[PDB]
């Protein structure tokens, strides 16, 4: 399955694939080190993962 | 669960 990247917001890049004609499959989230410390990236995920779980298909384990 | 990967110098990666 071919992957592609989208910008969720500046510095935050999600890698997606097609899945079952519904939500795209989330493969990874990349945080620009120009814009994010590791602490800020972990805070971003804590703040945004709820939305991410609903907008995308996210394997939980 | 998702894992943080911190070995790249350009991006922090959360690998699902």
CA gap A48, B10 in Å, rounded: 21
Residues of A in contact with B2 (CB under 8 A): 58
Contact A14, A24 (CB under 8 A): no
Contact B14, B3 (CB under 8 A): yes
Domain total of chain A: 1
CA gap A28, B5 in Å, rounded: 10
User: Which residues, 6+ apart, have CB-to-CB distance to B8 below 8 Å?
Assistant: none
Separation in Å, CA A58 to CA A36, A37, B7, B8, B10: 22, 24, 23, 23, 24
Contact (CB<8Å) A38/B12: yes
Length of chain B: 16
Structure tokens at A55: 């907008």
List the one residue out of A16, A49, A47, A12 whose CA is nearest residue A33. Answer: A12
Domain housing A10: 1-61
């Amino acid at each position: 399955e071919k992957e592609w990247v989208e910008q969720d917001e500046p510095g935050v890049y999600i890698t997606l694939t097609a899945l079952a004609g519904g939500a795209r499959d989330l493969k990874r989230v990349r945080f620009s080190r120009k814009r994010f410390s590791e602490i800020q990236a972990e805070q971003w995920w804590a703040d945004n993962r709820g939305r991410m779980y609903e907008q995308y298909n996210v394997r939980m384990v | 669960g998702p894992k943080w990967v911190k070995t790249d110098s350009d991006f922090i990666v959360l690998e699902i």
